Structure formats: C-alpha cells, structure tokens
C-alpha cells in the first residue's frame, strides 16, 4: 500500500438522443452531426454512481460510446449511413452542426467509420485532456497540447486553484447522420475505464 | 451406494413477465428493474415436476434464466437495451424498482451485461444461500454470509425446526430495462442444476 | 470487470486508552485486561474515511492493533510486562476485567505474547466472524462457529434482514497489564486489510 | 559541452517547527497536521546558498525532509505517533489543519508512514510540478496535471512571462501528529537533488 | 524529401440516387442501369474536402462505390437483384439506359456481381484514365488506351494546356436493377485512394 498504488474502475452513464425528422430541403440528401466528450465528474454525478471517490489522482485510459435505437424503430428499416470520428481536441465543438450539410461532415476524417442510422454504433477511443500553452505569436491567446500516452501523467482529483480535477474535459467522439424521413430516438451508454492512484482520506474537518 | 452417494438433476419452471408501456414522464428516458431468486421448493411445486424428492441433502451448483419476448412483439423493433446483474445477497430486493430511475440502475455493477429489450436475454449464474450471523455491533441485529464454493456445504431437505430446507432462498439475478413505448410480454424459463446426496426413505408412519 | 472482481483496501482508525494508577491492594501485584474487536462499520464511520463503499461483498483478511504510550511517559521507565492474546470468539468479553486479578489473566493462552507496559505492543491477527448455530442440546440457546480461511466466504455489505453486513463483529485481540504506580495514556491505531467483491451502484432511487 | 549537457547539485535549507502544547479539548486525543512544498527559489534565497545559477533549465529529481526534535526534549519521553504522507498536488494545502481533528488526518493515505513525535522523521519523495489545464466542463475554471517521470520535461529557470521558473511549486509532503502535553520544537532540514541543463551566460547588459 | 516523394490520401463524397417506381410495361420484368466515373476534381470540389492540393502529380490506385437504401425502405422487403460491372472505358456511357431492358444489361459482363435491390452493394475497382490515340484507319477519329498498372504513369495536377489535370475521367463502374414496384432512395458514398507525388508551392504571384 504505497503512494503509487493504482486502482481501476469501470464507470457508465446513459442518456437519450434524437435525430429529428427532415423538415428542410425536403427531398434532398442532407447531413448533420453532434458529439460527445468525457469528464469524470459527468459520471460521478450520475444518480447510481458514487458521487465522490477517495483517491488522489486519476487518468482515463479508455472511453466507450454505444448508441442504439429505441422507441420502436425497426432495425430493418434502412435510413442510410453516417460516420463516427475520433476528434481529440476542442475543434470537435464545430461538428455539432448548426446548418444542414450537403456532404457528410465527418466522412473525410482519417479513422472515420461508417455506421447505419437504423442500427446505431459502438466505438472505443482514448480521450485526451488538453494541456495549456499560452506562448503564442498572437498576444492574449492560448492553445492546447495533449499527451500520446495516458501513462505519461496523472490528474489530481482536487488539484488546481478550483479543486475541479474531475471536471477536466477529455476529447472526444463525433457522429454524423443523413437526415431521416422520420424521427429516431436512441439510448446512449458511455463507459469510462479509469485508473485511480493513491487511496486517500476525506479532507480534514474545519 | 454409500452415505455420500450423489445424484444430479435438472429442474425447470416458467412464468410470464410484462414490461409496461411508459405512462410516466412520457418523452424522457427512464429505467426500471426486477429480479429473480432461486429456491428448490419453487421448482418442486411446479405442476409437471416431482413435488417431493427422496434425498437427504441438496446443493444448487448452477442456475439459469432465459427471458424471451412473446405476444407478437417484433425482434427487429428496437426498444433500447438494459442490463443483467448477478446479485448474490438479499440486497437484490431493492432492485425491483418502486420508482422510475433516470439511469440504468444495474449498469454500474461489475459483471453487468447488456441485453436488448426486443430480444430478451439468457444468463447462467451460481446462486448463493445466505448463512446467518447474529453477532453484530448493534444488538439484536443479524447479517449474512455465503460460501464461495458450492462444494463446501450441503443443505438437508428436511433439516431445521421447520423441515423447510427446500425453501432456502438462493440469490440471485436482476435485470433492468429502459421503459418502452408499448407493453412487451415475455416467457421466462428458469433452470436449476441441483446435486442431491443420499437416497432416503419416506418419513416413518405414525 | 466480472461479478467476482476483487479490490483490496487498507483502513485505519485511532483512539486513546488509559491504564489507571493502582489505587487498590496497594503494594501488591495485580493485573487487569481489556480487548478490541473489529467491524468494518467502525472504520467507515471514522471521520477521515469513506462512510459508504460501493462494493457488494467484503471479507477481512487481516487486522492490526498498535498501542503506544503518549502523554510524556518515559519508555525507559519500566512498569513490568503483560500479555496480548488472540481470542477469536465472543468469550473475549470476559477479559475486560471487572475485578483485580492476582495473576496475568492472558498469559496461559496459547499464542500469548509478552509486551512491556512502557513500550506498548504491535500485533497482527486474522479476526473471525461468528456464524450462528441454533441446534443445541438446550432449548432456546445458540452457539457460534467460525471458518478457518477467510477465502471460504463473503459478507455482503447490505445483506441480511437489517442490511447491516458492515457491522459484523470480528474477534479479536485482548491485552493484559500489571497495574502501574502512575497513570499511563496510549495512542491506539487499528488497521484492517479488507478485500471487497463486485463494484456496485447506489441503491435505486425510491 | 553540448546544448543538453547536464549538471546535478544538492541544495539544502533549514527552519524551526513547533508542535504546541494541547490547550483545547484537554483530556481528549486530537490530531493536527502541516505540510511542506519544494521550490528551487526557496533554496537559492537561503543565506549560504548561491542566489543565482547560470543554467538554462532544471528539474527536481528528488526531495527530502528530516525533522528532529530540539529544545531539550527527551527522545525517551513518548508522545505517541502521527504519520507522514506524500501528497503531490495542491490538495495538500488543506492538510495544514485549521481545526483539531478527532482522527489522524493522514493515516488513511496509501503510502502513509508512522513516525513518533519524540523522534521526528526522515522521508524522501519525488515532488511534482503542476501543469495547467484550462478546458473543464465548468467555464473559466482550471485544473492540474503532473508527469509520472522527471525525465519527461525541463523547467527553464527564466522561462515564461515573469522569468520565474525557479518559483514553480513542487508537491509535496505532509505530516500529522497527536497533540502533546508540552510544546515540542524541531529542527527541519530540507534537501533538493536537482539536475540542471545547459550552462548559460548572464543576461546581456542593457 | 526528394522529387519522387509520394503521399497517399483517402478522399470521399456522397450523393443521393433514386430507382423509380415501375410505371412502364407494368406486370413485366424490366431492367435499367446507370454508372459512375471518378475524377479527382469531383472530390476536391466537395464542400468538406480541400479544394486545392499542393502536389505536382497524382494517380488513383483504387476506387470504391457503396450504395445503401434510405428513406425507410425495408431491407427484408425483396425487390430482386441486379448486377454491378467494372467498365473501364467510355463505352460505359451507353449503360445509362434510355429505354427499358427486357434482360439485365450488365449480367453478361465478365466480373459481373449480383446485388440485391433492397440491400445495396459495395464494390472496389481500379479505375482507368484514357490515353488518346489519333492514328486510326478512319480520318478525323480517335480512340483510347489505358495502362494495366497504376504504377506506370503519373498525372500532373496542372499539366496540359488547360491545367486541368485533376479533371481526368477515370472509368468506371455500372450497376443494373430490375424495376421495383415502389420508388427506392439510396445514399451513395464514393471513395478514392490517391497517391500524390512531390509537395509543391503555390503558383508564383503575378
């Protein structure tokens, strides 16, 4: 039971997602996209999970997204195919489309994988936290950097000036779809595979 | 034909299960759950099974639950996915939910396994009987303990002050589900793989 | 991440203990004794520890008691020697002496180990939970039984009719001492080495 | 004599520490704690050390804390035992207790190590600098990350907009103690084992 | 980084395709067909792709066509089978039928592979650019030749009197279908696997 003792937990949460009936540019093929990011706090605040953990540091080795249709949608009712893409930086926010796309906005990505709208998808990835760089050629601007291996660093749960280590946003997976003729509802399940370092007491009483 | 002669039987029973049309929080994703426990008497009292066995002891090596839809439900009509979980103590009783859950109540369990509402599931487990402990730090309260291996102990069919050995409750499997848009009926089949020890006569005449 | 996934934690708590100045049978050698038992709940209720754990079962592999003098007592100030003894059943309650003993009440025990009053002691043991036996030759009486190996069974945290699995009392260590000429205060630290089985969600919302 | 030429130095500083006579809840066992962090500037500003170094980068491979009693305190006068803990993030600041603790606030830590109040302690550690993350799920908040190996990065002594590279705070070691019956004064010695990269000139004249 | 440095990219674009409800020769089996050709410019003009590439030469090593039904068409709804055929010259233009065929117009082709109307198809091919021959036995007529291996030649992006290297038409894939009883809409995804030679600057400023 040393300072560097490691523990590994699996955490999950679920939510609903809707792809709306096509009501624009009717009769034509259009695409839209959304995305998901991963933060430990998102999973600890879920009702059935432990809301605090007695560990000093953590690191997300792996994340999983699984979206499957519900609401009585027929799997054999073909509604075309879109793509998933692993986007491991904050650029992913641009891929929640605010306007109809005339092409699949994620298909050109290296690593883009096809998925059929009526079946959903399942994909694993290594989501990345974003380290800060403030020394840019333009003043008063910052950029990001992320590490190739999760074993390189640790995120303290209560480190930093906000004690908000569990809220670090790890990027990230996006998914696109051709707009269907009828609304489709999905059940989404996210999973985190997290390593924790150093069992720790509660903060001292004040 | 010694005192420790062993016999093995397979026992089964069936019953109907209903997942009700969602009539609460319509438009939201909600989850509920139920559970099953195993007792030898539950199977011997089934109509087509032998209602009494001429053995002195028994032990349940393995149990099995299969739930498949009926009532004309389409397997290709997707209604999301829930989870099954092996819960081998009386805590399982809390997982027959009495209120709608905003998250899958069983997914966080180690060993939780996904299953699709429209296809049902099949799972095998080693259900455990609960040994009594009455020496707790709070007076007049009791707790439970179960044994890691079924080969460790035997249960007399007629042992104890009530001769109710066959009614020992073995835990246990729970299953959760997102509430669907229509009612779904299932056929559930349970199977016990039971070892019996010592062929025995009837009780003496009185 | 299976049903049988195991985790191991170290838990500790501390408290003060006093051996009072001898005020009886003055000038003569007398002995007294006290004892300690181990319950998981005792450690989870300690301020700096997690007060609930999200595991389904547990088992105490090892327990440790360490009592050391404080309050400015000189280690080189000899006050004789007493004994520690591992007593793994409820008989230990008789060894909190209510009357002065003319002999060391724990020395005859097999496994009794000497300890010097002015230095304290440190001892590891395997504490035992007490399984119930109610079939005795005398009516309306029960007795106990404990298992040789901790790997034999599991205690569900919320199992039993009281959901008080963490309050099972594990026996046990006692310690005796010759009554000193002046009061001595000690700091006692207990440690549990506990294996937990099956990461589990919170109980469903009601 | 290349750009990546490395030099290693040992640096030290000392200071006094006091554990105060217990004047609150007299008669009860209470605990308090304090902590130490490491910054190169803390050592260079010490009177007998070089106040500026002609190197471009540095990295702290190892740090060391030794606290031994003084003021005439007897080592054979027992005052119980507390614990030391390696806490490598800014959470350590909470472990300078501002209120009396009823339990040892550091004992539950993985890696916690006992130490006797009357003898002091000595412990080595790998203290960590905190890298900034500004992309959290809560807007305008930040968190930290540190690297598992000191060989992964270098800290420029004069890098950044403030040329304050030597002031990076490396975490960290905390120590707890039961409050004694009399005041105890200590001499604390800290030691840094620091690698430096690239012998460098003074800044150009202006 | 030599003149012959090669880069390889994957490029994709999508569009809609309709097979119209049969309104001619009703009650009888009829067939129609269409075709696709490949030009780098077709993919660079697509909205999400880079519209200019800074390379000197290119060559298409592989092309892919995937057409899948959408619009709510049931995959389990049989509508017969047609064929795909790789036609690597401009004769393919004749196989966009302008009159109903009483036989499958592509089935006789060597390499013809059947596909079911209700599931779509996926086929890979090596599309061919057409080299000009003007020396024919008939005056003022020209013919075509293509090379067996893609490694034999390179197409400069801006070569020729029109700088229209990216507009070379590569042949080619055709697909036939028996006319269904109801209209069927498809999503079509084309993919190019293109090797580029010699990273190049922009054209000089004028």
From TrEMBL, chains A, B, C, D, E:
Its main location: host cell. The keyword DNA-binding applies. GO terms for molecular function: DNA binding. GO terms for cellular component: host cell; host cell nucleus; T=1 icosahedral viral capsid. It is found in: Host nucleus; Virion. Keywords: Capsid protein, DNA-binding, Host nucleus, Host-virus interaction, T=1 icosahedral capsid protein, Viral attachment to host cell, Viral penetration into host cytoplasm, Viral penetration into host nucleus, Virion, Virus endocytosis by host, Virus entry into host cell. One of its GO terms (biological process) is viral capsid assembly. The keyword Amino-acid biosynthesis does not apply. It comes from the Viruses. Homomultimer. Assembles in the nucleus, presumably in an immature form, then migrates to the cytoplasm once assembled as mature virion. Interacts with Rep; this interaction relocates Rep into the nucleus. Belongs to the circoviridae capsid protein family. This is Capsid protein. It comes from Beak and feather disease virus. The gene is Cap.
């Amino acid at each position: 039971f040393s300072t560097n003792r490691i523990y590994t937990l699996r955490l999950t949460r679920q939510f609903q997602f809707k792809i709306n009936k096509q009501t624009t540019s009717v009769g034509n093929l259009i695409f839209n996209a959304d995305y998901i990011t991963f933060a430990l706090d998102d999973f600890l605040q879920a009702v059935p999970n432990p809301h605090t953990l007695n560990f000093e540091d953590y690191r997300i080795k792996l994340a999983k997204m699984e979206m499957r249709p519900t609401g009585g949608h027929y799997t054999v009712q073909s509604d075309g195919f879109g793509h998933t893409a692993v986007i491991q930086d904050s650029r992913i926010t641009r891929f929640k489309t605010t306007a109809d796309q005339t092409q699949d906005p994620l298909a050109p990505f290296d690593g883009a994988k096809k998925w059929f709208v009526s079946r959903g998808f399942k994909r694993l990835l290594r989501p990345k936290p974003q380290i800060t760089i403030e020394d840019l050629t333009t003043a008063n601007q910052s950029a990001a950097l992320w590490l190739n291996s999760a074993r390189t660093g640790w995120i303290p749960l209560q480190g930093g000036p906000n004690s908000a280590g569990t809220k670090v946003r790890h990027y990230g997976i996006a998914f696109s779809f051709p707009q269907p003729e009828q609304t489709i509802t999905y059940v989404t399940k996210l999973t985190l595979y997290v390593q924790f370092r150093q069992f720790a007491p509660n903060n001292p009483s004040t």
